[PDB]
Amino acid sequence: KNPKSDKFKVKRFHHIEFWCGDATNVARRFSWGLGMRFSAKSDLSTGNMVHASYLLTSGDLRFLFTAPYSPSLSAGEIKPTTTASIPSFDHGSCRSFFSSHGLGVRAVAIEVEDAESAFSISVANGAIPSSPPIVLNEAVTIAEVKLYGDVVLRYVSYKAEFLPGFERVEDASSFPLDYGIRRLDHAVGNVPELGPALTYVAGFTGFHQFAEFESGLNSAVLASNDEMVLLPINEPVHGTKRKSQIQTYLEHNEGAGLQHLALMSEDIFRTLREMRKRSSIGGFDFMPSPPPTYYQNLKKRVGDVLSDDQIKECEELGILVDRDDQGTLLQIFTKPLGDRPTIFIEIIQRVGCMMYQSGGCGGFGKGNFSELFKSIEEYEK
Amino acid sequence: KNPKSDKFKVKRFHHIEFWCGDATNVARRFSWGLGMRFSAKSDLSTGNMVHASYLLTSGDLRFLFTAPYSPSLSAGEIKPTTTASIPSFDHGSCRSFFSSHGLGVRAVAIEVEDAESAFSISVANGAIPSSPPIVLNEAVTIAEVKLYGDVVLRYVSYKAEFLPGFERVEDASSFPLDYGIRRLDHAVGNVPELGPALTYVAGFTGFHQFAEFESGLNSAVLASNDEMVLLPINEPVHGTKRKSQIQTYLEHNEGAGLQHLALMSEDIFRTLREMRKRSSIGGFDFMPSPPPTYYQNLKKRVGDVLSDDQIKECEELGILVDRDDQGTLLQIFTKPLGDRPTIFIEIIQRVGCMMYQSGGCGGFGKGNFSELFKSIEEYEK
Ligand SMILES: Cc1c(C(=O)C2=C(O)CCCC2=O)ccc2c1c(=O)n(-c1ccccc1)c(=O)n2C
Ligand SMILES: Cc1c(C(=O)C2=C(O)CCCC2=O)ccc2c1c(=O)n(-c1ccccc1)c(=O)n2C
Ligand SMILES: [Co+2]
Numbered sequence: 021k022n023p024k025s026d027k028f029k030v031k032r033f034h035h036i037e038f039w040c041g042d043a044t045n046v047a048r049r050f051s052w053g054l055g056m057r058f059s060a061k062s063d064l065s066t067g068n069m070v071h072a073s074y075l076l077t078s079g080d081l082r083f084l085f086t087a088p089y090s091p092s093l094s095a096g097e098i099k100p101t102t103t104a105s106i107p108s109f110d111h112g113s114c115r116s117f118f119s120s121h122g123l124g125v126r127a128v129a130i131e132v133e134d135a136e137s138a139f140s141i142s143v144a145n146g147a148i149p150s151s152p153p154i155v156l157n158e159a160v161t162i163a164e165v166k167l168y169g170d171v172v173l174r175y176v177s178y179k180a181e182f183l184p185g186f187e188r189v190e191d192a193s194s195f196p197l198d199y200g201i202r203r204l205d206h207a208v209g210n211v212p213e214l215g216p217a218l219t220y221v222a223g224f225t226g227f228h229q230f231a232e233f234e235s236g237l238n239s240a241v242l243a244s245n246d247e248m249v250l251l252p253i254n255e256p257v258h259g260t261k262r263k264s265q266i267q268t269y270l271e272h273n274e275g276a277g278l279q280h281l282a283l284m285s286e287d288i289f290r291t292l293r294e295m296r297k298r299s300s301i302g303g304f305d306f307m308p309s310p311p312p313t314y315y316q317n318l319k320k321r322v323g324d325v326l327s328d329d330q331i332k333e334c335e336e337l338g339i340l341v342d343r344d345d346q347g348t349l350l351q352i353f354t355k356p357l358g359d360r361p362t363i364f365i366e367i368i369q370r371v372g373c374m375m376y377q378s379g380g381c382g383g384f385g386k387g388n389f390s391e392l393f394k395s396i397e398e399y400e401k
Numbered sequence: 402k403n404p405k406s407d408k409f410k411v412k413r414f415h416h417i418e419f420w421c422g423d424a425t426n427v428a429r430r431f432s433w434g435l436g437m438r439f440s441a442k443s444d445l446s447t448g449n450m451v452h453a454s455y456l457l458t459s460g461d462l463r464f465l466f467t468a469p470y471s472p473s474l475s476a477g478e479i480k481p482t483t484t485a486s487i488p489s490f491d492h493g494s495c496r497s498f499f500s501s502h503g504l505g506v507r508a509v510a511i512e513v514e515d516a517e518s519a520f521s522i523s524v525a526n527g528a529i530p531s532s533p534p535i536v537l538n539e540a541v542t543i544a545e546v547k548l549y550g551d552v553v554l555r556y557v558s559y560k561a562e563f564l565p566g567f568e569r570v571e572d573a574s575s576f577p578l579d580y581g582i583r584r585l586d587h588a589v590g591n592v593p594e595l596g597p598a599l600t601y602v603a604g605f606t607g608f609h610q611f612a613e614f615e616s617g618l619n620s621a622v623l624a625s626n627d628e629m630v631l632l633p634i635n636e637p638v639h640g641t642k643r644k645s646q647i648q649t650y651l652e653h654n655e656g657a658g659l660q661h662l663a664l665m666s667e668d669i670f671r672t673l674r675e676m677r678k679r680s681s682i683g684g685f686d687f688m689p690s691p692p693p694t695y696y697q698n699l700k701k702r703v704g705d706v707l708s709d710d711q712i713k714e715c716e717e718l719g720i721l722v723d724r725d726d727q728g729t730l731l732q733i734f735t736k737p738l739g740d741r742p743t744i745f746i747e748i749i750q751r752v753g754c755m756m757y758q759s760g761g762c763g764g765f766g767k768g769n770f771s772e773l774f775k776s777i778e779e780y781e782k
């Protein structure tokens with residue numbers, strides 16, 4: 021059931037901003053490993069004396085990487101005279117975020133009809149303000165509220181290319197990489213307590229709980245009206261045999277934050293072939309693959325959706341498969357993106373729920389906790 | 402003239418340590434862009450709760466990338482009980498270094514006969530101590546003194562694989578990249594005042610001035626007995642037409658530090674082909690190439706050392722060429738390695754001075770300041 025209780029008009033995920041120590045090196049690594057092109061920049065060469073920000077794109081997916089310069093370069097500036105292209109940026113906040121959490125997501129940005137309105141309504145409904153609405157070149161409005169931990173939910177709205185003050189990157193510096201990733205499907209937070217986290221965010225957005233079907237977690241999913249913005253949230257379950265990966269996150273991340281970004285591919289097989297070719301030459305590594313019993317067990321579960329060849333292709337690439345009552349999910353998880361066992365990426369593709377495909381078709385793979393366990397025991401034979 | 406006045410026995414450059422915000426992402430980028438394999442690690446998976454350190458190698462060149470974890474992971478430790486593999490590491494120092502300078506070199510490490518002796522003698526001769534000699538697993542001794550700014554000169558000596566507590570990386574995670582780079586030729590510091598910098602370092606090492614032949618700089622080179630350890634130092638020259646690149650460095654770096662690392666290739670043509678193929682897919686960009694007049698002018702200067710084809714190959718790759726009285730130098734410079742216009746890399750190959758090749762054969766390319774200027778004017782025709 022979907023009560024369509026959004027308190028302001030939400031369109032789509034717009035972008036994800038990483039706060040880095042060196043934006044250049046993270047962005048170049050992510051570009052190669054994920055097949056995203058360099059699309060826009062705001063840095064010293066564009067007149068920004070405050071921060072370096074580089075934008076990667078693949079389809080509609082937008083990854084922004086930002087790091088502070090020396091405060092000495094902009095010491096004479098004040099907010100009215102700032103050269104920063106993202107007015108919510110603050111040197112002290114960025115250094116404190118990164119020193120506290122390491123590399124990770126600072127902003128989950130969604131496009132809305134009116135960012136000023138979304139901010140006002142959100143704050144009126146319990147949101148903790150983080151950066152007030154600011155109109156950029158009379159063209160774009162951006163505002164931020166706290167989501168969980170030091171992660172903010174960023175609203176962006178356009179009167180009518182990324183943001184004013186960003187320049188389109190030189191054609192020669194912009195190699196057209198593409199491994200098939202097309203948009204952000206969902207963005208997941210880890211928190212110590214799921215209940216209060218859910219009440220707060222659903223409180224100020226109006227997002228409704230998205231319907232699901234000892235793994236170390238309890239989780240729930242918040243969703244916008246058309247269920248295209250999906251924000252799952254996890255809490256640990258303690259006292260378990262194997263230590264909870266949610267708890268390990270909170271420990272190494274110094275508290276709550278974004279756990280994983282799930283990127284939808286138009287062809288998960290090609291995406292995984294391309295990413296795995298690059299794992300040991302600068303790209304991303306993947307979780308260890310399930311045993312062959314897991315793939316033997318796929319004939320019975322989804323043998324009506326995937327052929328034997330497509331199931332064998334899943335096995336070659338370590339892909340996981342789960343199923344709802346409305347659709348099927350193909351998924352795989354990377355190892356952590358940086359030094360700490362905190363943030364990782366999920367690659368996904370959804371089959372079914374055609375009307376356009378409805379959001380969350382096939383779920384989020386919680387069925388794969390059971391099947392991975394049974395599979396491991398099966399293989400132990 | 403070489404008075405061979407070293408105050409302790411120095412062997413070779415051993416390694417360069419970068420202090421990073423996220424060592425994983427910098428190391429993966431450098432590996433792909435320079436063609437260096439992952440050779441050793443010390444991180445959570447090896448029991449190091451203090452820092453993540455990853456070692457890349459190409460031939461004898463050793464790049465170490467280190468970043469701190471949350472201090473909370475090791476809050477119960479004391480130096481006697483440390484899990485750090487590099488006992489000189491300090492969370493506060495590393496965060497302060499990186500927040501002050503951004504990505505750059507923390508340690509220039511040289512192998513010596515006896516690191517304890519080199520430390521004692523250095524300090525007795527004016528060196529500012531930074532980390533006292535510490536014996537690792539009764540096998541390796543490491544000690545550090547200040548070089549310039551927040552850069553240290555690290556001494557390492559072995560009784561008899563990188564350092565104790567480092568593990569050799571998994572074969573599958575260690576792809577055998579190699580674009581022909583083989584060793585560190587020289588490591589260059591930028592300082593506000595060359596005179597005091599030279600007197601200090603030559604004071605405590607015994608290194609002698611290495612013989613040279615409005616570019617924005619004055620420079621001098623310090624060298625060990627066999628002139629295989631080469632430490633050039635630059636200071637700005639002010640009041641010039643075009644602003645001094647040494648001054649821009651000092652401003653953006655918040656003071657003195659390492660300007661460039663020069664990496665010797667066994668085949669600079671292949672190295673530059675391989676690096677340029679990767680510039681826009683995660684690797685490194687190069688300075689804009691000299692005009693064709695520069696290469697037309699190469700026939701007269703070095704036409705007895707390089708064929709017409711080799712000169713044309715230099716022109717295809719943007720390589721610079723300079724000449725001593727004893728040898729010839731092929732060189733090219735990358736754009737800055739990270740966000741700030743501070744540290745960059747030089748690729749070089751030296752021709753001549755065969756006895757083994759003697760160090761610094763052909764110089765450091767200061768002749769290319771003149772030739773680049775004349776070339777630009779020539780081309781302006
Ligand atoms: C993160 C994840 C998801 C996932 O995306 C996700 C959502 O989108 C929102 C709902 C909660 C949730 O979990 C699905 C299945 C996973 C995992 C996962 O992390 N692990 C795992 C655990 C410990 C070590 C290695 C892997 C799994 O085993 N399964 C089977
Ligand atoms: C750094 C460099 C070197 C070099 O390696 C080096 C040493 O090893 C030690 C002695 C001093 C020194 O300079 C040689 C020649 C260079 C440059 C250089 O930086 N530039 C440059 C300047 C401004 C913008 C872009 C490039 C040059 O034009 N030349 C021609
Ligand atoms: Co997910």
Ligand SMILES: [Co+2]
Pocket residue numbers: 587589661663747765
């Ligand atoms: Co040089």
